[PDB]
Each structure stands twice: as C-alpha cells, then as structure tokens.
Design a binder for this molecule. Structure first.
Ligand SMILES: O=C(O)/C=C/c1ccc(O)cc1
Lengths: 121, 121
C-alpha cells in the first residue's frame, strides 16, 4: 500500500516521501501518467506502468510484508500479486534515490492536469 | 482554473497554495471528496460540492478573470459557468483563510484513499 511505498522511499532517499514525491511531475503520486518532466518523474512513469501488469490487488491500499535488511528492500512472502506489487514499489524507491541528483523542487507540487498525455505502457 | 484558484488562496491565506492545500485532508486539492478532517478540510468539501453544478465548464482547466482590489477578490464578468466557478473559488479561498487558526500540518499530505466516504452533496 501507500504505507509500504512511502516507507521504502523514505528508507532509500532519506526524504519525506509525501512531501517530495506525493505530487512530483506528471507521474509521481496521485493521478495517472503524463509525459515525464525529468528522470525522477520517469521513475514514477515506469512505476505506474508496473502497476498495470498486476492481477487484482490494490496498489494504494493492500498492505504487504517486506524488510529493510542490510539497507536493502527485500520483498517478503505474500501472495503472487502482492509480491509483484512490492517489487514495483521497490523499483521506484531505488530509482528515486538514484536520481536525487537531478531532483527539481519546481516540479514538487506540479499541476498535473496540464501535463501532456503519456504514451501507452 | 487551478491558476486562478491557487492565486486566490495565496492572496487570502498568505500560504503556498499547492503545498498547504494541494493534498490537505480528505477534500482539499487532488481527487474528490471525503469525510472532512477539520474546518480547513470542510471548506474544500463545500468547494467541490459547489463545483458539481458547473457541468458547463472545467474547474481545473478553464481560465477566468478576477482582480485583487482593496484586499478583496472581485470576480470579473465572464459567462454563467465561469462566473459561478470564480465564486466557488473565491468562497473557498476566504474559508481557508478564515480557518487558518486550526490548520493542522498532519493533514497536509493526507493519504486520501483511506478517507471515509463523504455525504452526498
Ligand atoms: O517542508 C515542509 O513540510 C513545510 C514547511 C512549512 C513552511 C511554512 C509553514 O507555515 C509550514 C510549513
């Protein structure tokens, strides 16, 4: 759920997840996808395309088990859809930390309705 | 549109609109309505109910004219829908400012999917 996803982002980046990524660019946080504004945004683009391959679990609300082991996100047992979901979330947290170097606060509270339409996944 | 709405909120409250109200509680900013968390939140509840009659225009994207005269929001002429849209936005900016006394940051980046369902408008 948003709880695990947020903890993952905090653990990787060291940043307040909701504040830094809750409404970043055309793709991070609420709502769907748009043409990515930069690398950070594109992380969330991939992230939401990852969600489209899931098989019925709720990416926003379904809790799952994972652990922070040797400073690594390790997706726990769960069921297959939750496992894939946890992997989607792990991938975007890692990607957001990797791209901290081009993080732009001007995209932080982006007016997503004016975003250009995204290509299909 | 969001440009006018954001400027009204900034002028009345003195606060960064996107940051303080873009995701506040169950009702302010992105997405729809939910059971209000407080008075600030309930402003945005009334706000979005005010929007439900505006089926003739787009509250997020349609621009309109208004001026800031004598520290007052004055809606410009416009057509019936845009005028009403302007008055919705003026009323929430005022309400948000009037309720600054109980603004709570714990609701600033509220996880809206876990919000309880709202009463019908
Ligand atoms: O970074 C933040 O979350 C908030 C900064 C902030 C700035 C002015 C305020 O009145 C409240 C919070």
């Amino acid at each position: 759920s948003l709880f695990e996803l947020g903890k993952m982002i905090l653990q990787e980046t060291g940043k307040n997840p909701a504040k830094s990524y809750g409404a970043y660019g055309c793709n991070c946080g609420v709502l769907g996808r748009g043409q990515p504004k930069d690398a950070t945004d594109r992380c969330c683009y991939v992230h939401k395309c990852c969600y489209k391959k899931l098989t019925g679990c709720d990416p926003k609300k379904d809790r799952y088990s994972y652990s922070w082991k040797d400073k690594t996100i390790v997706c726990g047992e769960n069921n297959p859809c939750l496992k894939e979901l946890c992997e989607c979330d792990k991938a975007v947290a890692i990607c957001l930390r990797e791209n901290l170097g081009t993080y732009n606060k001007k995209y932080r509270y982006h007016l997503k309705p004016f975003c250009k339409k995204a290509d299909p996944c």
